[PDB]
Design a protein around this ligand. Structure first.
Ligand SMILES: [Cl-]
Ligand SMILES: [Cl-]
Ligand SMILES: [Mg+2]
Ligand SMILES: [Mg+2]
Lengths: 228, 229, 225
DNA sequence: TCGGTACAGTAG
DNA sequence: AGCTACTGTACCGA
């Protein structure tokens, strides 16, 4: 909103625009930041009471750990490698099927505070963003192919809605790709901006940030240390 | 009342069923999109509430449809299958000593000519019974069966055993576990009789499941059998 | 004493490089501190052993009858073993207490129950010194104290005091990734409600194990031959 | 309680 | 960011 490339450079020493999604600089820029693919944890509610669910508390401590250590752990598994492997082919096939042009984007922060950001799978020539998924199980691709909007995983929905909150955009493509499918290997939908989600982020996210600052202060740390 | 023949299998898959051995390439091919004994508990599963299909049933529903449309199936539980493969012969040789019946290895067996439903027994016995001979990856699981008997693990395996009897049209089935790590007495088994309650469940539930699969396949322009051609 | 253990296991405690074949052999069939939570687990209503408890029951019986144990946490143990020396050194500096490394400790001659402390302290306390695989877990404890992790570790700590007949126990976490202040610890006092729980539930669990072993023609001790 | 299913939680 | 896959608790109707 008042975010500028210079602010990023002065705080992190990193030139945004030169960041090629997945490189050392990209990992560095996400440290301690409430990000799209993880925000489902922030909006998670107890079924009774007000006590934070374990998944919310776990993400809370994960972000704080990133601030105080200045690092994030690396995990590897077949499903993760699969998604990484076919992302490029998914995007190309999406462009060919939909007829829209996709531009790759590095991280996008909501504002100058750098507390909140998303890393879109692409930005489209029609003003929509793009999220791709390449399910490791053909089962889960089939679930999306047959069910569509109502079949979308709640984590992906929170991720897509958060991306619209961050970028101030109004619509986001959600595409699934399976290279193993003989036919019908690509399926996508358009997810509209949901103001119920926007209201939820406007309420829960700033409170999550204040809670983090309180926690950092208790232990003698301050947000930003991960970048110095 | 099956009208299934080896020629039907050969024409639509290209595979000689008589040459099939459990775990081979042809074995895996012949199981694509097919409702199998080890997975049927998903098909006959009932909701926690309401009248809709339970989550686990919808998952298997999507799993089988995916096999039809991709022509492949992922290899899960590699460690346990390799363990079972390593001790297949020893288990069988010990089972034959203890029981006093001879075991003949079997290819995949389909219920009927539609090739929608099948089982793969660990052997067929000289007394007319089929055989399930597991080599549990964890000794804990062997011990559970050793001490609790049939009643302890009926939740996990009764459906599978009954389905094998539904497929083969047999009246009884051996359910056995072998654990080579046991210092002595590493074989335990029970005999399970054909249960007509389970047979009635398969007769009403399975065909409906098949019909809903064909509906979904048609919705995306696929037909059962594309996995084999 | 080591000579009694040597006579019954064929393993000399003074040796044991950890965690070798002999290290794992000593725990076979033994109710251990980090697994005791399974023994003390109750159903929400009634008296039937919950699945966790039955699972552990069968796991232990399998260890006696097979004389082997599967190995988990290859990644987590490799992390801990790398930093165990630096963890202890920093704990000694912070606490002002000196730590002696301790082999396995059995509660009694029956050798049915044991704990494996990360050290025995000069003030008389025991030590649990963990290097959590995630910095997330370090932070949970750093900010929440023992209230944040009592769910997971109170049983293990209390059981260790039950086994050793000690009155207090250090619970510490070390994280080398922390830019500063990478050691956090609390002192946990002996809880007599936990002691009473063990005095009741542990003996009956052992009795039920021996009953099952006798049913299948096995006896405790066979794993060490 | 029994005999199960749904899903939070979390490793990898 | 990447997507399961397994464990254990919550939950549900009889
Ligand atoms: Cl222990
Ligand atoms: Cl121990
Ligand atoms: Mg992405
Ligand atoms: Mg994606």
């Amino acid at each position: 909103s008042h975010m500028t490339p210079d602010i990023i450079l002065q705080r992190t020493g990193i030139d945004v625009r030169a960041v090629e999604q997945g490189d050392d600089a990209w990992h560095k820029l996400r440290l301690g930041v409430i990000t799209a693919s993880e925000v489902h944890n922030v909006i998670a509610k107890p079924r009774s009471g007000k006590k934070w669910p374990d998944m919310k508390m776990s993400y809370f401590h994960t972000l704080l750990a990133e601030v105080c250590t200045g690092v994030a752990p690396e995990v590897n598994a077949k499903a993760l490698a699969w998604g990484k492997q076919y992302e490029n082919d998914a995007r190309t096939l999406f462009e060919f099927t939909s007829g829209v042009n996709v531009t790759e984007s590095p991280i996008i922060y909501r504002d100058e505070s750098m507390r909140t950001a998303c890393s879109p799978d692409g930005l489209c020539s029609d003003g929509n963003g793009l999220e791709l998924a390449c399910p490791f199980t053909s089962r889960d691709f089939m679930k999306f192919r047959l069910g569509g909007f109502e079949a979308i995983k709640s984590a992906y929905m929170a991720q897509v809605q958060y991306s619209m909150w961050v970028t101030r955009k109004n619509a986001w493509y959600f595409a699934n790709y399976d290279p193993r499918m003989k036919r019908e290997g690509l399926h996508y939908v358009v997810i509209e901006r949901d103001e119920k989600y926007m209201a939820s982020f406007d309420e829960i996210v700033p409170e999550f940030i204040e809670k983090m600052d309180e926690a950092l202060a208790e232990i003698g740390f301050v947000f930003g240390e991960q970048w110095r």
